[PDB]
Amino acid sequence: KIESEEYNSLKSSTIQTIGTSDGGSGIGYIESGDYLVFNKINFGNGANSFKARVASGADTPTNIQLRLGSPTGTLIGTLTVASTGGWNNYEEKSCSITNTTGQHDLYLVFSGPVNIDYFIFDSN
Numbered sequence: 001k002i003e004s005e006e007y008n009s010l011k012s013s014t015i016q017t018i019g020t021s022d023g024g025s026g027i028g029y030i031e032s033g034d035y036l037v038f039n040k041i042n043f044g045n046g047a048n049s050f051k052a053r054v055a056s057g058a059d060t061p062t063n064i065q066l067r068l069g070s071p072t073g074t075l076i077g078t079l080t081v082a083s084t085g086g087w088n089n090y091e092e093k094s095c096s097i098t099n100t101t102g103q104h105d106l107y108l109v110f111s112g113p114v115n116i117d118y119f120i121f122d123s124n
């Protein structure tokens, strides 16, 4: 598990840390082409699944690309998030990823807006 608001670096001119109504925090005000960087993520044993707690009031879907090494590095999967009913209505959404082990920098690269609280890598 990784908290979006605990990124090491980012590329954005708009991203803000936001709250949720449950007393948590996360990332909003994301625009197309922004990315969050999480350095030295040990995928440990194995990961073939990605789950994120996300909210969206957008009227088009946002793709969250999961890239290793650089923003144009190996693409291991893409979570596509349509509206959840509103910007403060969080749901947990999952995608499969190419099985990943070892230590990589992780770039979440966004095609549009989404509010994100946290994400979890697991093996189904």
Ligand SMILES: O[C@@H]1[C@@H](O)[C@H](O[C@@H]2CO[C@@H](O[C@@H]3CO[C@@H](O[C@@H]4CO[C@@H](O[C@@H]5CO[C@@H](O)[C@H](O)[C@H]5O)[C@H](O)[C@H]4O)[C@H](O)[C@H]3O)[C@H](O)[C@H]2O)OC[C@H]1O
Pocket (backbone or CB within 6 Å): 018, 019, 020, 021, 022, 027, 028, 029, 030, 057, 058, 059, 060, 061, 087, 088, 112, 113, 114, 115
């Ligand atoms: O304390 C807590 C508060 O922090 C919390 O505040 C909420 C923080 O998050 C806010 O959500 C932002 C709402 O505004 C969005 O910008 C939208 C994004 O969509 C744009 O339009 C898009 C254009 O591109 C199209 O292709 C796409 O389909 C469209 O959707 C629109 O122009 C922008 O206005 C941000 O992305 C969100 O992060 C939320 O409103 C606050 O309420 O509230 C709870 C409290 O406990």
Ligand SMILES: [Ca+2]
Pocket (backbone or CB within 6 Å): 003, 004, 005, 024, 025, 026, 116, 117, 118
């Ligand atoms: Ca969070």
